[PDB]
């Protein structure tokens, strides 16, 4: 495929202004919820015995259309995410070449507990895998995190946070990424409490703005034998906070998809 060059793609380096207004959600959504006048959906996982969490969608007409803010205090593993919701029995390759331009501010080191994640997230199903562990996949492309008491938020996380096994590395979008596979044994999932696998790409140089060539990660995992199967659930921008008290505030989250010749198939938002 050829890199898209369409003028509607917002240069991430330019998206430096605080967005305003927005619609805020303070409770668990119970899965994907569509957003009004948008191709995207949000999800919130906010445990009631935890403290106050929020996701604020900045709307259809600013910040690339998928931009959001989130806050947490004493979360018990808060996830706020927004982007593509699919879950229509189609493989990731059906959605062609997927990209996400982003630019955010966030709170600093140790404001999100012992573990946290910022980047791209979703699930995929592989009913064809012979090993039942491999039939459901939770995935992360980790651009950034909040560090902890042991490592700076400027150092990449590793297996001490993720669990599991380093499979290898590759370079895309200006950094090396370390690829990790983990098995979650009898744990909560989009299919109920069961055993499933997680795939991670960890960005070795954490960053708060740039473009993610998402499809490249999918191609790389599969190439290493980490198969995603033929039914992708979603592909969303995520902030996950294990604990602490902090914030995430995007000026830009813009998903787009292009064919192999670089023609835009989908972009948000919708002159003389």
């Amino acid at each position: 495929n050829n890199r898209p060059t369409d003028e509607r793609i917002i240069d991430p380096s330019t998206a430096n202004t605080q967005l305003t207004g927005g619609v805020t959600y303070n409770t668990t959504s119970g899965g994907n919820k569509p957003l009004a006048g948008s191709p995207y959906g949000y999800e919130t996982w906010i445990d009631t015995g935890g403290g106050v969490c929020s996701l604020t969608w900045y709307g259809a007409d600013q910040g690339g259309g998928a931009a959001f803010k989130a806050t947490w205090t004493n979360p018990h593993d808060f996830l706020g995410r927004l982007g593509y919701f699919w879950n229509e029995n189609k493989p990731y390759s059906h959605y062609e070449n997927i990209y996400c331009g982003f630019n955010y501010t966030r709170s600093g080191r140790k404001t999100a507990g012992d573990y946290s994640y910022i980047g791209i997230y979703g699930w995929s199903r592989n009913p064809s895998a012979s090993n039942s562990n491999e039939r459901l996949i939770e995935y992360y492309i980790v651009e950034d995190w909040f560090g902890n008491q042991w490592q700076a938020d400027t150092s990449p996380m590793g297996i001490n946070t993720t669990g599991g096994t380093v499979m290898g590395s590759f370079t895309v979008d200006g950094s090396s990424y370390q690829i990790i596979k983990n098995t979650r044994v009898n744990q909560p999932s989009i299919e109920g409490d069961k055993t499933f696998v997680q795939y991670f790409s960890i960005r070795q140089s954490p960053r708060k703005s740039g473009t993610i060539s998402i499809t490249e990660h999918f191609r790389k995992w599969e190439r290493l034998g980490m198969k995603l199967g033929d039914n992708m659930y979603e592909c969303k921008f995520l902030i996950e906070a294990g604990a602490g008290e902090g914030f995430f505030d995007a000026r830009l989250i813009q998903f787009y998809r292009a064919d192999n010749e670089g023609n835009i198939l989908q972009i948000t938002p919708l002159h003389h």
Side-chain angles (χ1 to χ4, degrees):
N1 72 297
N2 299 320
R3 287 255 164 207
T5 45
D6 199 286
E7 75 177 324
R8 288 169 296 169
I9 294 171
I10 295 149
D11 185 338
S13 81
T14 72
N16 295 313
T17 309
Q18 181 64 54
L19 301 175
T20 53
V23 42
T24 302
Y25 308 101
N26 292 109
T27 69
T28 295
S29 60
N32 182 73
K33 294 208 104 74
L35 298 153
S38 176
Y40 307 121
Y42 85 96
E43 178 158 358
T44 45
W45 176 251
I46 299 166
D47 293 298
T48 41
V52 173
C53 301
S54 67
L55 183 150
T56 300
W57 177 50
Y58 283 124
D61 301 311
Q62 58 180 351
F68 71 90
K69 180 171 134 146
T71 68
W72 53 96
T73 167
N74 273 16
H76 299 345
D77 192 23
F78 160 71
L79 290 74
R81 65 185 195 269
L82 200 153
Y84 290 131
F85 186 76
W86 296 321
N87 192 37
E88 52 180 358
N89 202 28
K90 302 180 185 184
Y92 72 87
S93 59
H94 164 80
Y95 307 90
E96 300 276 331
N97 305 278
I98 311 151
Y99 300 88
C100 184
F102 70 99
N103 182 316
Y104 60 85
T105 54
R106 61 162 171 89
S107 58
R109 199 199 160 158
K110 305 156 80 177
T111 60
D114 280 357
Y115 67 88
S116 52
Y117 298 100
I118 304 174
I120 304 290
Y121 176 88
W123 297 75
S124 191
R125 305 178 219 249
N126 187 12
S128 292
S130 49
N131 186 340
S132 59
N133 298 8
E134 292 167 4
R135 297 179 190 163
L136 182 63
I137 301 96
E138 185 188 34
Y139 76 83
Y140 291 74
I141 304 163
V142 187
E143 293 297 284
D144 197 14
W145 70 322
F146 294 84
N148 57 23
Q149 64 179 107
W150 302 276
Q151 319 168 241
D153 60 319
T154 50
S155 283
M157 68 177 69
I159 59 165
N160 290 333
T161 306
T162 65
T165 311
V166 176
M167 293 294 293
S169 293
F170 84 123
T171 288
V172 67
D173 301 310
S175 176
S176 178
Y177 283 75
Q178 185 178 76
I179 312 297
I180 293 150
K181 179 176 163 170
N182 185 50
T183 300
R184 292 277 282 156
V185 176
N186 192 228
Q187 293 291 356
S189 87
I190 61 159
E191 284 179 7
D193 284 10
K194 63 166 66 178
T195 298
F196 59 96
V197 293
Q198 309 178 296
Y199 303 168
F200 297 83
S201 293
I202 313 299
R203 195 183 172 89
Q204 295 302 279
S205 317
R207 58 166 188 181
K208 301 172 178 72
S209 68
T211 302
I212 307 158
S213 296
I214 294 159
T215 293
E216 305 262 61
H217 292 271
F218 296 159
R219 290 175 183 163
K220 196 38 175 181
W221 300 336
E222 290 215 326
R223 168 130 218 107
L224 288 159
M226 289 153 72
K227 306 298 191 186
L228 285 161
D230 55 4
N231 180 9
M232 186 150 281
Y233 182 68
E234 74 184 318
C235 181
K236 296 189 173 181
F237 202 98
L238 170 69
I239 188 285
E240 185 171 359
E245 183 182 353
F247 81 89
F248 169 80
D249 200 337
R251 290 81 173 92
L252 179 71
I253 305 182
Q254 187 192 38
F255 286 95
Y256 50 98
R257 306 181 302 102
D259 62 28
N260 285 348
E261 281 295 314
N263 305 295
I264 298 304
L265 301 163
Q266 183 174 24
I267 193 145
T268 53
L270 188 150
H271 199 98
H272 85 277

